[PDB]
Amino acid sequence: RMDDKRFNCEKELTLAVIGGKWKMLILWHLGKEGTKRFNELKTLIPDITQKILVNQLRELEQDMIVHREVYPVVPPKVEYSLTPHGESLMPILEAMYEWGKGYMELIDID
Amino acid sequence: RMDDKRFNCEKELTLAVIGGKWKMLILWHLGKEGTKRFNELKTLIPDITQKILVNQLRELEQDMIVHREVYPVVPPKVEYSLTPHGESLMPILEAMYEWGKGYMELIDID
């Protein structure tokens, strides 16, 4: 049957949502730390630039992975969190991390 | 600390081992079905060509993901299976598949 083409597309889709080097970092910290403000992510990933960070958060919110919420307190608070889909994505990223550690260990200690 | 750069490299390493459209298919069938002969993979992924399939299996065996074993019976049998690392990689691929299904459902039924 056509079970390969759909397996490929549905695994590829997850890869694109993960994308390049920046999206998975933002998710990782939101998953472990919880809600964070823009400044806080900016400093938890000091390698990231201001312009890149707003672009990645914007794609992630349109991709319904990251939720933005504004609390009109004094002064107002705008904080970022994971959509339920983002949370269901966290185990995968932790699994990939753990496998990378064990495989890098393997490569290193032949 | 430098916890991002190592998280990135160790997640990237897993992505490279997964690589493009062919390596994850071969693993998937070996994980679910078990040991398979070359012909059998060739037919379980009919889209693959002979030349591509031997290249991907060769990278996967050098990457210590796929194990090749020869049984000198009559006539001899050469069969492919997953190294323990390949088996520890299967849950990740099943998780990515399940997340892709639910996220594609989401995209589709807004």
Author numbering:
A (entry chain A), B (entry chain A): 3 to 112
Q: What's the publication's text?
A:
Both FA-treated and -untreated HxlR adopt an overall topology similar to the previously reported MarR/DUF24 family proteins that bind DNA in a dimeric form, with each monomer consisting of dimerization domain (helices α1 and α5) and winged helix-turn-helix (wHTH) DNA-binding domain (helices α2, α3, α4, and β-strands). Our study on the FA-sensing transcription factor HxlR revealed that FA induced a specific intrahelical crosslinking reaction between residues Cys11 and Lys13. The resulting methylene bridge (Cys-CH2-Lys) on HxlR’s helix α1 caused unwinding and rotation of its N-terminus (“N-terminal helix-flipping”) that allosterically rotated its DNA-binding domain with enhanced DNA affinity and transcriptional activation. Taken together, we confirmed that HxlR uses a gain-of-function, intrahelical crosslinking mechanism between its N-terminal residues Cys11 and Lys13 to sense FA and trigger the transcriptional responses.
The distance between the DNA-binding helices α4 and α4′ were 34.8 Å in HxlR-WT-FA-DNA and 44.0 Å in HxlR-WT, consistent with the DNA-bound and non-DNA-bound forms of MarR/DUF24 family proteins, respectively. Interestingly, a covalent bridge was clearly visible between the side-chains of Cys11 and Lys13 on the 2Fo-Fc electron density map of the HxlR-WT-FA-DNA structure, while the side-chains of Cys11 and Lys13 were located oppositely in helix α1 and their side-chains were separated 9.6 Å away from each other in the HxlR-WT structure. When the dimeric form of HxlR-WT-FA-DNA and HxlR-WT were superimposed on one monomer, the non-superimposed subunits showed a large conformational change, with the wHTH domain rotated 21.9 degree and tips of the β-wings translocated 24.6 Å. It is noteworthy that although the superimposed subunits of HxlR-WT-FA-DNA and HxlR-WT fit close to each other (r.m.s.d. = 0.595 Å for 82 Cα atoms), an obvious difference was observed on the N-terminal residues.
